[PDB]
Amino acid sequence: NPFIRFEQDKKLFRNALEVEGLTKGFDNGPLFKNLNLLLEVGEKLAVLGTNGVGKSTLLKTLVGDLQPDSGTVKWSENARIGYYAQDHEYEFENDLTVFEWMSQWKQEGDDEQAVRSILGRLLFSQDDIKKPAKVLSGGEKGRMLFGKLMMQKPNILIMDQPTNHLDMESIESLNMALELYQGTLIFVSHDREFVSSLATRILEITPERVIDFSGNYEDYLRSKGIE
């Protein structure tokens, strides 16, 4: 059972995000129509909706790598964003040793004694820290990105499907790691258990119109009419 826990270096107050008129589409036009929202601090926003629709590309626009058609996204002043992309190959195509790859993100005020502690908690013991970063398992890679988020210590976590290639032990450790998190969280998942365990607001998009909520997934289903 890996020991994962995200902390927050500089807590930020009042609104953490605001999105004003974020219409965008690639070639179907209204991928999401006239989005308008304001995300407070401590929100755990689970963005649902399932398939081919802009379930992602919302996160990509929020981080900025996918320019929107119209609209402006105003992050908080000190907002530091930890991004866990759904497709994360580009950060491992470069072939560094696991130790160097985890050491890229060491911050001001920590050693390579403290660098290796994250890998130790992530169960990379003595030889699995000598492998090329390219040759690693899918779960052993998702964990290695979790250990980069932990190392950067963000105050806004955006995670595109953080439950990929992770066994029961990992989706039981990270679930409570994010539950103890004190900060802004934006995530997307399909399994009706991980999203239901930790969520205070649901924003799911349907290929005609977004629908927003203000409660957890159980109340969401009862209001939808699902037994």
């Binding site: 398939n51 081919g52 990929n164 032990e169």
Partner: protein, 228 residues
């Protein structure tokens, strides 16, 4: 039926798995479970022959068409979706494309004509005439539109071509299915369709899955890969 004897793969200075010897076969479905980094993908590579073991054997019958899954490649990207799912049948694909090449090159001489007649009868026996139709009746199940069935592999979306790569594996009822994490980044409806279409088949299937509700749904045996 597939057998493996003393596979013993090792790169480093710690045992990975030792003297693995097991008979896979009989129509049973073996969910292969384990931790996040133990042996599963490098074991379904060995069972398909992608990499030979450090010292061991894998035995298969002279003709047993292994239907295995991707997610070690993404970039075929040279041809249409129909003829992309078709080439899951590595036997039929070669005869089809070779006879197309022969038709392209002039002329059908006596070497060419006698080289082609037997390939044509082989194609008929392999029922390539109704190959594209049965491929399309599966692409519709996966969720790809009929009007763009014939589009090339660049027309498809990056998040939509893993659907085609999944449909390739289970093309025409191939015995021994090597499924490596098939349900990842798939939806509830597609998962239900897949677990329904795998429930109507008599073909041993070794499946990697880290979830419980799919293994507990389809699988019969629960092969583990822990402790070595």
């Amino acid at each position: 039926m597939l057998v493996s004897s003393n596979v013993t793969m090792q790169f480093g200075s710690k045992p990975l798995f030792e003297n693995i010897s097991v008979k896979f076969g009989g129509g049973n479905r073996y969910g292969l479970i384990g931790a996040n980094g133990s042996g599963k993908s490098t074991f379904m590579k060995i069972l398909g022959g992608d990499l030979e073991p450090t010292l061991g054997n894998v035995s298969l019958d002279p003709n047993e068409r292994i239907g295995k899954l991707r997610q070690d490649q993404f970039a075929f990207e040279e041809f249409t979706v129909l003829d992309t799912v078709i080439m899951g049948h590595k036997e039929l694909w070669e005869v089809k494309q070779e006879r197309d090449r022969i038709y392209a090159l002039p002329e059908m001489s006596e070497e060419d004509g006698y080289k082609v007649a037997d390939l044509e009868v082989k194609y008929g026996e392999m029922d390539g005439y109704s190959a594209e139709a049965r491929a399309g009746e599966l692409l519709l199940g996966v969720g790809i539109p009929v009007e763009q069935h014939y589009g090339p592999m660049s027309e498809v979306a990056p998040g939509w071509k893993l659907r085609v790569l999944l449909a390739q594996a289970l093309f025409a009822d191939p015995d021994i299915l090597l499924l490596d994490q098939p349900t990842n980044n798939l939806d509830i409806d597609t998962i239900r369709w897949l677990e329904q279409v795998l429930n109507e088949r008599d073909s041993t299937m070794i499946i990697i899955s880290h979830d419980r509700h799919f293994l507990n749904m389809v699988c019969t045996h629960m092969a583990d890969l822990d402790y070595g």
